[PDB]
Amino acid sequence: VCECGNTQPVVRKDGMKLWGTW
Amino acid sequence: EVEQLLQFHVATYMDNDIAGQPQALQKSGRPVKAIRARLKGKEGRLRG
Amino acid sequence: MSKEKILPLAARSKKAMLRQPKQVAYFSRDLNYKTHPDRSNLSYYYLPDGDIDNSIDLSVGSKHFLLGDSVELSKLDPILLALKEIEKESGAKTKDRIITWRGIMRKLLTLPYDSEEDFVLDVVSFDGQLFIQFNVPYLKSKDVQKQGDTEFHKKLQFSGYKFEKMATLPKPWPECTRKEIDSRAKSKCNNIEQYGAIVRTGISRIKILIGGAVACTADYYDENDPLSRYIELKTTRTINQYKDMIAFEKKLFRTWAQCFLLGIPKIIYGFRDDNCILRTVEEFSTNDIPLMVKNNPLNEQPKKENCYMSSINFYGAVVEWLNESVKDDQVWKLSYAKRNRQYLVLKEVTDENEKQQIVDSAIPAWFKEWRSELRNSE
Questions:
Q1: Where are the transmembrane segments (chain C) (predicted)?
Q2: Does residue A15 belong to the interface with chain B, where contact is any CB pair within 8 Å?
Q3: How many CB atoms lie within 10 A of CB C6?
Q4: Containing H/E element for C353?
Q5: Residue C12 to residue B22, Cβ atoms within 8 A
Q6: B29 vs C205, C305, C312: nearest CB
């Protein structure tokens, strides 16, 4: 949890791009 | 995808030994001498 | 006039980056070549260290070995069944471009450095998607050459399959019984029954849907990332000289390519002597093998150019060439000749009868009417 009530997506590095998992 | 193409171009320009992806190879087959290796290793300027 | 294309062997993809592959479907081919979307034929790996000490021979039961039809196993029926299922579930056409098996793409990846085998492949374009498989007359010629193989080669193949039988279980380890474990020595070996995974992968801008034959899984099945628990098995002659390391790393390149295609994180070898006796069992990591071969102490500098990255670049270049060259509703042939070893030749098919036969071998009729009603809905 942040300090806002919003779930933090996980950032994964695929190749050179970054993908968010909410 | 074209933006990622430009990103890979600048990445190979700056870094040669990139993990999990091919390095920029010259027309003779040798890798392109990136600026990261210009200061690291025996061929690097820091060793001399 | 027929159109022919020539691709130089030195073709290397600049940006053949690999999107992490995800298993979108799974299938289990039965003894009658029928495909069901289940994990009935999926195996589970199990091989303790102490089993090696038993000096188990890998030739028990070679006289009653079974072999499936090469033509029947080369058809793309399971992949088309899975594609129809996912299309019906989603209701929208997938963006995938290339449909293939694991062995075909391993041959296309290991071609520059494994140039001791010949093959011919047929490509059919349908609904903007390319389906590639083996060539039936060349496969029959291959079988014709095959029955001339000595019983030693048959015993070696049966030894590999028997090693696979002994190192796997038909169920998860807690759910297996003792009888299913100790009776693997008398278990009949066949090439017909197998388990496969239908996995979407990404190379550059191309989505490839690959059907990979999975030997077994590590300890269970993960519904989130199925690829992370997969494991396969291989057999190789033991090592006693420098040529032995050379041959072993040539085989290691092929097996690493096969595991990299389907995203297998781990590789396992069983070592056999001239008497087909299991000697050693070793395990390796897919991402560690490229570093392991380069950092060997016996030959620090065999070559200044890394063969693995060049192999990946050649694979990406082949994928891009296949996507770009083949147009819609075209049937083409890609035959690799080991006598030349200079370039890849791509030809068009103009005989309507042979083209229709190839289509029927690749695209069954029922899938044709399924895609027809999908088109009518579209």
A1: none
A2: yes
A3: 9
A4: helix C352-362
A5: yes
A6: C305
The radius of gyration computed from the CA coordinates of chain A, to the nearest angstrom, equals: 11
Q: For residues C235 and C224, what is the distance between their CA atoms, to the nearest angstrom?
A: 31
CA C143, C78, C24, C317 torsion: positive or negative?
A: positive
**Residues 1-22, chain A, touching C (beta carbon < 8 A):** 14-16
Q: Which stretches of chain C are assigned E, i.e. beta strand? A: 4-8, 18-29, 35-36, 44-45, 98-101, 119-126, 129-134, 168-169, 194-203, 206-213, 216-217, 230-237, 266-272, 278-285, 331-336, 343-348
Structural method: cryo-EM
Q: Which chain B positions have a beta carbon within 8 Å of C12's beta carbon?
A: 22, 25
How many whole angstroms separate alpha carbon C247 and alpha carbon C232? 20
Please tell me which of the candidates B5, B22, B25 has its beta carbon nearest to residue C16.
Answer: B22
Strand pairing of C168-169 and C206-213? unpaired
Which residues of chain A have a CB within 8 Å of the CB of C20? 14
CA nearest to C27, candidates C258, C270, C197: C197
Alpha-carbon gap, residue C135 to C361, rounded angstroms = 10
**A11 is an annotated ligand-binding site residue:** no
Q: What is the resolution of this structure in A?
A: 3.4
